[PDB]
From TrEMBL, chains A, B, C:
This is DNA sliding clamp PCNA. The keyword Metal-binding does not apply. It comes from Leishmania donovani. InterPro entries: DNA_clamp_sf, Pr_cel_nuc_antig, Pr_cel_nuc_antig_C, Pr_cel_nuc_antig_CS, Pr_cel_nuc_antig_N. Coiled coil: none annotated.
Length: 248, 248, 248
C-alpha cells in the first residue's frame, strides 16, 4: 500500500490543474523515490513529466512500485473543493480498486475524505527526448504567461528568436502582427548561437499555467528539437513540459 | 395604510435574494407584530417562513392585518440597483394596486422611488410542518454553505449523519464518493439518537444563501420528517426553511 | 511621417474602449493641431467627437494632415494586451497601408510593437449640430453611469427632467417605474428654463463608459436639440457625444 501526505493541498490543487490541461487521465508511478506522472497529449506533440520527490511530503511510504491510473478531470473536480491550507493525504491499500484523499484542518475540527476509482490507462508510448540544450532563457513565469496570452490575440503560433541581448516572441493573425521583446536584464538568456523556433500557442498556453508553482520558468531550445519548459517545485520536484517545434 | 423604512437596505436585498431562490412570487403578510412571508416551492418539497418583527425596522405602521402579493423576479431586479447603505422605505397607500420602494443616502442628496404592481397570489394550503425536533446541529453559516457546494460535485443528494461525535455530510456520484466530518465543541450537536437522513442538494443550496443573513445556522431533524434550517436575523427576525427527506 | 507618443498608454486604452462602444471603425484626423476622431453609429442617431490637442502627447509630430482608417475592434483587442503604465507611440509612414503601436516600460527592458491594417472609410457625412445649449447639468461621471444602468432594469428610454431643484431621471416598463432625483447648489445644475427630454439608454450606456476618463461629466440640452454629453480628458482634450431625443 502507498501513503503520501502534503502539509498544504495548495500544491496538489496547483499541480493537477497544469497537467489536466494536457491530458484528462494519467498514470502516477509511485516508487520510494516519489510520485511521477509522465504523459503525452493525444496529438503526440507535447509531453508532461512531473516528479514529486519523497521529501516534498511530510509522510511518504511506498515499499514497492505501484502504478495508479487517475482521471485528472475528477481529481480536478475534487481538489477544487479541498481548502488551500488543509493537509491532503493520498493513500491506496494494495488490492483495492480505489485511491483516497483525506483533508484535515490544522485545528483538526474538520476532516474531509474523498475516494476516486482507478483506471487501466492503456498507452505509455513515452520517450523523454532529453537531448543537449544549447540555448537557455529564464524569466518571471507570470510574464511568460502574459506573453503567450498576448501572442494569442494575433495568431496561434508564437515564434521565439533568441540572441545575446534578448528574446523576441512574435505572432501573426487577421488582427495584425505582434512582437514582445525582452532585453537580457530579470531575463537570463545564455545561448551558444542565434536560434529561432516556432510553436503551437495552444500548448505554450497549457504549460504557462505552470506559473502557479514557480516564480520563474525556464525555456531550453535546440534546432529541430523539442523545447523544454521547466517549472521548479521548491527543491523537491519538477513539472517539465516538452513540445515539438512547428515545421511544414 | 402601511410604511416600513429600514435604515440599511442591505437587509432587504439579502432577504429577497434568499427567498427568490425558492419562489418567484410571494405574499408579504403585514401585521402590527411584523412582516411574514410563508411560501412553498412549485414542487411542494420546501417551505420558507420569514419573519421580520416590528422592532427590526425604524418606522413600521400597520393597524390592519393587510397582505401584499409581490413579484420577487421584479422585486429582486430593483433591490439589485439600490445602494446597500441607503434607507429603503416600503409603502402601500389605503388600497393602491402598487407598492412603492423609496430610497435616500444619509446626506439626502439622491432620492430613488421605484413602483411595483401587486399580484393576487392564493395564500397556499402548504401550512408549517408540526414536528418538535429531537436532534439539533448549529454550525458556521458559511462552512455549511461550502459543504453543500462541496457535496454537489459528487451527487444531487446529501446524507447527514448526526452523532454525539458530530455531523457527517456524505454524498456520491460519477466523480466518486466524498464526505466532510465535523467534530462537536465550531460545532454544537444536541442529539439523543443515531439519527441520519438524506436530502436534495438543489434545495440545501437554495437555503444556504442564508449565510448572507447570519454568521451561524441551526439545522433541526426529526426521524422520518422535514428538517428545518434556521437563520436568526439579529434578534429582530428569522429565516426558516423546511425540506422533505428523500425516502423509499 | 506621423508620430504620437503618449507616456501612460492607459489613456489610449480607456478611450478606444469608450468609442468602440459606438462604432467598429473610425477615421483619425491628424492635423498638427492633434488627433480627432469624428463618427456616427450605424443607425445615424448618435455622434462622437473626440479631440486630443498636441499638448496631450510627449512626442507629437505631424507636418501635413493625414487621415487614418482603423478597425477599432482590432485596435481594442491589441490595446487590451498593452500595459496601462507603458509608452504607446503611434506611427503611419507615407503611402504605407499599416499603422504601428509601440509600447515600452519605464525600465526600458520590454519593447512591444504591433501592426494593424489601415481601412478606407467614406469620410464623415453628417458632422456636429454646433448648438447654443440652454440647459446644463454637471455631476459625478460614475453616478451618471450608475443611474443609466439603474434605469435599464426598467425600460430602455430615460426621461431627463431639469429644474433648479435638481434633475429627475425617470423610466417605465414591465417591471414598474423608477426615478432617481439629484439636488443642486456634487450636482452643478444651472439652466435658463426648466425643460425635460427623453433618450435611448442604449446610447446613454455607451457614453457613460467615459466615466473611465473625466471624474465629472457635463450634459447640455435644448428643446428638440441633439443633447450632448461632454467628458474633459482633464484639459489635454475632450470626448463629446451627441444624441437625438425621442420625440412626439
Ligand atoms: N515529437 C516527438 N515527441 N518525437 C519524439 C521522437 C520519436 C519517439 N517518441 C522516440 O523517441 O522513441
Amino acid at each position: 500500500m502507498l501513503e503520501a501526505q502534503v502539509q498544504f493541498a495548495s500544491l496538489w490543487k496547483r499541480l493537477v490543474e497544469c497537467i489536466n490541461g494536457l491530458v484528462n487521465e494519467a498514470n502516477f508511478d509511485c516508487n520510494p523515490g516519489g510520485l511521477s506522472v509522465q504523459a503525452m497529449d493525444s496529438s503526440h506533440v507535447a509531453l508532461v513529466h512531473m516528479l514529486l520527490r519523497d521529501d516534498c511530503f511530510v509522510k511518504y511510504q511506498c515499499g514497492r512500485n505501484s502504478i495508479l491510473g487517475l482521471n485528472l478531470a475528477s481529481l480536478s473536480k475534487v481538489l477544487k473543493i479541498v481548502d488551500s491550507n488543509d493537509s491532503l493525504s493520498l493513500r491506496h491499500d494494495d488490492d483495492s480498486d480505489v485511491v483516497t484523499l483525506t483533508s484535515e484542518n490544522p485545528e483538526k475540527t474538520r476532516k474531509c475524505e474523498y475516494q476516486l476509482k482507478l483506471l487501466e490507462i492503456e498507452a505509455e508510448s513515452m520517450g523523454i527526448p532529453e537531448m543537449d540544450y544549447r540555448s537557455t532563457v529564464t524569466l518571471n513565469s507570470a510574464e511568460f504567461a502574459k506573453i503567450v496570452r498576448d501572442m494569442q490575440v494575433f495568431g496561434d503560433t508564437v515564434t521565439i528568436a533568441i540572441s545575446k541581448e534578448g528574446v523576441k516572441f512574435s505572432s501573426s493573425g487577421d488582427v495584425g502582427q505582434g512582437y514582445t521583446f525582452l532585453q537580457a536584464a530579470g531575463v537570463e538568456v545564455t545561448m551558444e548561437e542565434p536560434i529561432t523556433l516556432s510553436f503551437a500557442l495552444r500548448f505554450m498556453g497549457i504549460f504557462a499555467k505552470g506559473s502557479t508553482l514557480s516564480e520563474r520558468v525556464t525555456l531550453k531550445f535546440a534546432k529541430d528539437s523539442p523545447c523544454m519548459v521547466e517549472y521548479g517545485i521548491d527543491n523537491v520536484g519538477y513539472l517539465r513540459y516538452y513540445l515539438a517545434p512547428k515545421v511544414d
